[PDB]
Amino acid sequence: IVFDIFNYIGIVAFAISGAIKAVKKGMDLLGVLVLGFSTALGGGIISNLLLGKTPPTNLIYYPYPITAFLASLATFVFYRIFTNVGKPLLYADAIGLGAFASSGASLAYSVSNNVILVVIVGAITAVGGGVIRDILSNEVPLILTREFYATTAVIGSFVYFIASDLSVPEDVALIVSFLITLILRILAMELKWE
Amino acid sequence: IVFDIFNYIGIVAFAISGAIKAVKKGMDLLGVLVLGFSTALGGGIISNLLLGKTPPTNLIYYPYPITAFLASLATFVFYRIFTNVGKPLLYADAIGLGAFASSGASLAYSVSNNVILVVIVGAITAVGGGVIRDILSNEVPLILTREFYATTAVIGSFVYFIASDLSVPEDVALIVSFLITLILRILAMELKWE
Amino acid sequence: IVFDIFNYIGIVAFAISGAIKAVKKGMDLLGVLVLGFSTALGGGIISNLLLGKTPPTNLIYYPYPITAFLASLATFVFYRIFTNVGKPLLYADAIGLGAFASSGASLAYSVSNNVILVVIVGAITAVGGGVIRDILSNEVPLILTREFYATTAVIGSFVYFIASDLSVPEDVALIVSFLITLILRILAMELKWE
Ligand code: NA
Ligand code: NA
């Protein structure tokens, strides 16, 4: 059940991050929806393609794109009203990074217990939405500008792999991977490691 | 037969748009061919990947890439001679948007009657070539800069789905989806909605 | 055995090119690793997706990503020490272009003897890593800025196809395709064709 919850958490968090980016770039409602939608679902779609899972879950399981839409719309309405309140793009991205590094590693592990597949596909699941967000926004992505960003995704997917290898129950393994990924991002941002 | 015709119309229209972009960015013959080729075939390739259709039709069915090549070459020669005549990049893109939103939704519908799959894959088929064109050109894509652009693709794929759901013959369903997509773009551009 | 060697040559060469790009853009160790890793393995991953080969070889065959990592790390250490020695990004890219145009055409040919599939997938394998490198770096890719770049990849994959069609042994066919691709790039760069 933790797996199902993490999919929704990551979709909402990445939708908020993509919608925030759109608002900061001056876009209006429909363009904000496009960037939130793409950021929220891109990581899962890329991950499914790499694992040969077609059609991708994000394009068939109705609650996922509906959630991406509604979270992006809520973000637009929020900042259309409250134009001068802070825009935590990086914290929204970091929560999504933990939710998808853990859930993305879990999906890769179900295909094969190859550590390279699990760690790299999990990390691609985690950063993929934000990479799409940043490329569509015509700027250098966070995976290059933030020194510890992509490696923290790699670490979070690796701790999922290790926990699963050590027979840790899937719910616990997802939670621990999420926690380490998010804590490492919080430390990077709050301690000015980047 | 409308399906087969729309594939050629969209390939030519998107090749012209990518070749025009290349000419406006100062590229020469071979670079113009690369951008026209990529714009014309990218949407179909991405769509095939999302539906698990490999190898993609655009890389096996000879008339499609030959058409992409010849339309891109014709565009280069035209503007090499007539340097000062108008460059209708957006109208070429809009005709392709209608041809591929309709044909791309048709392909997705043949895989499954899931409305989310049909609408989103159809829209990705429609905008994908231009997104590739704009990313390769190092600028923000039309799906973000034009407020009604991506939503009009979504609308056109949705009207295909509705028409097919209502048992409208495939030729008519493709034509109506094409028409609505193109008319909505014409209205957006001519009435300064964006 | 030439096929296996070319995979390592192209991975090392593209890793060096992506790591050099990262160093020139001011990134530190971990960001240099991310760009080298992505450049070295991206072409193979895209090529596998187009041919329906999942999971991609670069994410399961341990020596490939290990080689990408080690070559990127060696490049960072080299230029961290020797900051003022030349940075042959384009020569590293050109060696990879020949190694992957040949090996990528070979992989496509094993799926089908369709000349369009072999030539275009082979060329996408050859340029894909550098296109990813350039998009992540927020600039126009070499396939658009260098007039003879993408066409030379197309030529190299085509000479592989012709040699294989003429029953030339695979080792020789790979070597000849590699040679023509690399020689054509050397001529383009040394004779100021671009
Ligand atoms: Na840019
Ligand atoms: Na860019």
Author numbering:
A (entry chain A), B (entry chain A), C (entry chain A): 7 to 200
What's in the article?
As evidenced by the fact that their genetic ablation led to compromised K+ permeability and Ca2+ release across the SR/ER membrane, TRICs play important roles as counter-ion channels for balancing the charge potential change during Ca2+ release/uptake in the intracellular stores. In this study, we analyse the structure and function of a bacterial and an archaeal TRIC channel. Both proteins have similar structures, consisting in symmetric trimers of 7-TM subunits, each composed as inverted quasi-repeats of triple-helix bundles (THBs) plus an added TM segment (TM7). Many other trimeric channels, including ATP-gated P2X receptors, acid-sensing ion channels and the mechanosensitive Piezo1 channels, form central ion-conducting pores at the three-fold axes of protomer association; by contrast, the prokaryotic TRIC trimers have three pores as calculated by the HOLE programme, one through each protomer.
